[PDB]
Amino acid sequence: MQKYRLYEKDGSPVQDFNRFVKGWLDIEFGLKEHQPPKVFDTIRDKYNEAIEAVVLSGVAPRTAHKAALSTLTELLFGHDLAKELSARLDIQPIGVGGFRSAHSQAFAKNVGENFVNLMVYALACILKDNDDVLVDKGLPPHLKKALTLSRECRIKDTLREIKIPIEGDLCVFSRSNHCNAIVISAATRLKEVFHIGTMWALFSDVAKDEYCLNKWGLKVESSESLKDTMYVFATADMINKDGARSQGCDVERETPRNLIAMDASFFDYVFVSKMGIGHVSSDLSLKYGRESLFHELGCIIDMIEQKFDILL
Amino acid sequence: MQKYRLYEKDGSPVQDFNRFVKGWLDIEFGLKEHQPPKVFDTIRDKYNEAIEAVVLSGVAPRTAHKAALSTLTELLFGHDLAKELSARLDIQPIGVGGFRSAHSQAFAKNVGENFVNLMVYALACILKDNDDVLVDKGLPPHLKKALTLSRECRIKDTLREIKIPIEGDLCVFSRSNHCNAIVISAATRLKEVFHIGTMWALFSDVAKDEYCLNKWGLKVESSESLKDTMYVFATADMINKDGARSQGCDVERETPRNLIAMDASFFDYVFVSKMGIGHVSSDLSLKYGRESLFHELGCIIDMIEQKFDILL
DNA sequence: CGCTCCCGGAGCGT
DNA sequence: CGCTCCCGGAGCGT
Ligand SMILES: [Ca+2]
Ligand SMILES: [Ca+2]
Ligand SMILES: [Ca+2]
Ligand SMILES: [Ca+2]
């Protein structure tokens, strides 16, 4: 097999970038910055399978990809990850008095990783003939540093430099300026854990605010640079409706609840890989403002287009 | 049985408060404000049995309660919660291809509630014959309302007012001034979810800051009211070291890692219910300043004393 | 029904 | 090893 790089020693992206990330998800070759995905092959193939048929039915790839992105939850629910993992990991509890198992650990991790893998793969495909607007899992080295706050912490005589790298699960960014970027935080479910996305959104704002940085003893490399860095959330909202005594989803309902709304309110945008929901917008316009606390995931192609001035 | 109140209709706490809290947890009588705890009996008895033995051994009761507080993780690990719940709840996966069971859900909820239940019970004991310094689960009605931010969120011609009630798992407060209080957030495990505590810590800071309030368009009843409200965190850090391929604890180690430090650095104090950890301080003086990022939980006796000017 | 609980290693990054 | 992933109802409060 072969193994390549995505970035050089100065942090610059190599040429033909997107095809390298897509080839990595395809298990075509290795990469310095990413391990092969452990359990991505089945669900990736089904994504392709679903979208090779659609575009064969005449439909333009752009539309097929918008629709697919907005249906990733169906895709994830259709993949029996449990059965695939069972042949490898112990289904019995890690501890004598515990409830988690290696299998449930693997399941939890992999379904989360596959959610991100999926929309990294999708964006890679829709951008595979563009070398101006790149997409990668995690953050490109320049944006990671830029999005890293520093907090000097003195306790008595002890001094501790605390490093605070603001979270991004994946990123689409400008080659000529990696700060010109859409930073995406993803979670397969919201619940109160959505709150985690919210401190990062809070830190993202703070990195731009000189008063706030001074208040908390925070330092940034540059607040100006981050002006073009947008911070969004994407979710699959996967609560299986057919659960015994299921209490329902956090987005697929008539209107999102109060404390769900607030987490969404501190992000620039929030997406759900679902399509039939009333309060969820299917239309996105950066210029005339946020249409709704929630957008269909397919709308991310629209802000990619509107921000970086391209067509897909 | 008999059923009583913790707060009068105006919000003021009834006399002889703290033994109404202890009796509720003893399931001597009912309360308006709290359901009786679902499965606290077994571990509550072990707590009592443990300190009566330590006291009978000749140890001063203050020293005994402090020691128990700093060993609550041992108590929780010694209670076979899973066995007690296996009679009632079903171990099969909630969903065909899922990984969670109604039993596991019960385990997770109840082990979290018991951790809080424990140190509420402990503090109610420690404060048995004090009616100026009170302890309750959750927040007293006036501190609760005082810690509730609001956010006007206009999208387009919609408008929704967003409530943001800053979290407290349990609270120790002055009868004469409920905003003279220690608010405590608790978690059995840290991991990355400690991050949730951190946004709430940020919100509690924000509620005292006019610039920050205005920045994110937030309203509070009174910033100056919260000047004596302190915001701390307590953790049991229960990662069982006997789990196969265990990665160990977040505070029981030579040095808390960077991002665990970060979360801790945004709280006034962080406690662990473990003793004998090198970096974890066993001394607490408000006057001379935070001794370290982490304290033994028994040191909460010490800040209660210093802050409210009482002897326990 | 709103909101919160999480007896934790797998997996990936450095 | 640092940090993050979580096919979600039970339980408590209202
Ligand atoms: Ca994420
Ligand atoms: Ca009295
Ligand atoms: Ca009795
Ligand atoms: Ca808590």
Numbering used by the authors:
A (entry chain B), B (entry chain A): 1 to 312
Sentences reproduced from the published study:
PfoI belongs to the CCGG-family and cleaves the 7 bp sequence 5′-T|CCNGGA ("|" designates cleavage position). The overall fold of PfoI monomer represents a typical PD…D/ExK nuclease fold with the structural core made of central four-stranded β-sheet surrounded by α-helices (50–52). The PfoI monomer is composed of an N-terminal α-helical subdomain (residues 1-131, colored pink-yellow and blue-green in Figure 1B and C) and the C-terminal subdomain (residues 132–312) that bears PD…D/ExK core (colored orange and cyan in Figure 1B and C). Structures and mutagenesis indicate that PfoI features a permuted E…ExD…K active site that differs from the consensus motif characteristic to other family members.
After numerous trials to crystallize PfoI with oligoduplexes of various lengths containing 3′- or 5′-T overhangs or blunt ends, diffracting crystals of the PfoI–DNA complex were obtained using 14 bp oligoduplex SP14 containing the C:C mismatch at the central base pair and 3′-T overhang. Crystals were grown in the presence of Ca2+ ions that do not support catalysis. They contain both polypeptide chains of the PfoI dimer, and non-cleaved, specifically bound double-stranded DNA in the asymmetric unit. Altogether four Ca2+ ions are found in the structure, two in the active sites of the protomers, and two additional ones on the surface of one of the protomers. One of the water molecules that coordinate the Ca2+ is in a position just slightly too distant for in-line attack on the scissile phosphate, showing that the Ca2+ occupies the canonical metal A-binding site (54–56). In the complex with cognate DNA, the N-subdomain of PfoI undergoes significant structural change due to the intersubunit swapping of loops (residues 78–111) that in the apo-form do not contribute to the dimer interface. In the PfoI–DNA complex the central nucleotides of the recognition sequence are extruded from DNA stack.
